[PDB]
């Protein structure tokens, strides 16, 4: 699609946005993902849903893209603290960081 | 990340947006959240889902971030009024207020 005129300007924007904004945003966002993934997988009392570190980050990525669930009834010792960490993560990335990325991409 | 050049301008934007826009938006949005939380938890006839004030605001925050459900079949006395309040809340915050915040953050 570099042959036409109204398509090369759409095929170079992928390269510009990937090399400038999305990589920088992921280099920031991986820190929040790892921190809240360990912080949620630590306090789960063993037998549920937030099993290990290779599952809590999947649940958090679904929560960031807008899938999944946000159920309070988990097998934790402090469900108020668990809900507070989940609300802090959703406020930090679903509202602040992703829309700041959208403004920078604009 | 203040050491580099293309990262300090990404680490100061979090401070600017948090101190200018997100705090102001939450100071407005908490009023709508409290008002519709009491207005929905008041008219639920006791035995469901909209149990108390500490659960209706959880359901409304899930409805604002785009999770949850919007089922009409609730244990209310006026389901038309309940659905009208829910549609008014979704129109007020999911379409108007959050996208106005996005424009101001841009």
Curated annotation (Swiss-Prot), chains A, B:
Subcellular location: Cell membrane; Cytoplasm; Lysosome
Binding positions (Na(+)): 66
Tissue specificity as recorded in UniProt: Abundantly expressed in CNS. Widely expressed at low levels. Detected in dorsal root ganglion (at protein level). Expressed in the keratinocyte layers of the outer root sheath and, to lesser extent, to the matrix of the hair follicles (at protein level).
Extracellular compartment residues: 75-77
Result, substituting residue 8 to C: In OLMS1; gain of function mutation; results in constitutive channel activation
Domain of life: Eukaryota
Stretches of the chain found on the membrane's Cytoplasmic side: 2-4
Residue ranges within the lipid bilayer that do not cross it: 49-74
TM region(s), chain numbering: 5-43, 78-106
Disease tied to this protein: Olmsted syndrome 1: An autosomal dominant, rare congenital disorder characterized by bilateral mutilating palmoplantar keratoderma and periorificial keratotic plaques with severe itching at all lesions. Diffuse alopecia, constriction of digits, and onychodystrophy have also been reported. Infections and squamous cell carcinomas can arise on the keratotic areas. The digital constriction may progress to autoamputation of fingers and toes. Palmoplantar keratoderma, non-epidermolytic, focal 2: A dermatological disorder characterized by non-epidermolytic, abnormal thickening of the skin on the palms and soles. Focal palmoplantar keratoderma consists of localized areas of hyperkeratosis located mainly on pressure points and sites of recurrent friction.
Reported function: Non-selective calcium permeant cation channel. It is activated by innocuous (warm) temperatures and shows an increased response at noxious temperatures greater than 39 degrees Celsius. Activation exhibits an outward rectification. The channel pore can dilate to provide permeability to larger cations. May associate with TRPV1 and may modulate its activity. Is a negative regulator of hair growth and cycling: TRPV3-coupled signaling suppresses keratinocyte proliferation in hair follicles and induces apoptosis and premature hair follicle regression (catagen).
Assembly: Homotetramer. May convert from a homotetramer to a homopentamer to allow pore dilation. Interacts with TRPV1; may form a heteromeric channel with TRPV1. Interacts with SNX11; this interaction promotes TRPV3 trafficking from the cell membrane to lysosome for degradation.
Family in the record: Belongs to the transient receptor (TC 1.A.4) family. TrpV subfamily. TRPV3 sub-subfamily.
Protein name: Transient receptor potential cation channel subfamily V member 3
Species for this entry: Homo sapiens
Lineage: Eukaryota, Metazoa, Chordata, Craniata, Vertebrata
């Amino acid at each position: 699609t570099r042959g036409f005129q109204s398509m090369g300007m759409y095929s170079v924007m992928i390269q510009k946005v990937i090399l400038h904004d999305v990589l920088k945003f992921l280099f920031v966002y991986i820190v929040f993902l790892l921190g809240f993934g360990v912080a949620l997988a630590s306090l789960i009392e063993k037998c549920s849903s937030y099993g290990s570190f290779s599952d809590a980050v999947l649940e958090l990525f679904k929560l960031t893209i807008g899938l999944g669930d946000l159920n309070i009834q988990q097998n934790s010792k402090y469900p108020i603290l668990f809900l507070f960490l989940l609300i802090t993560y959703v406020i930090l990335t679903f509202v602040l960081l992703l829309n700041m990325l959208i403004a920078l991409m604009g």
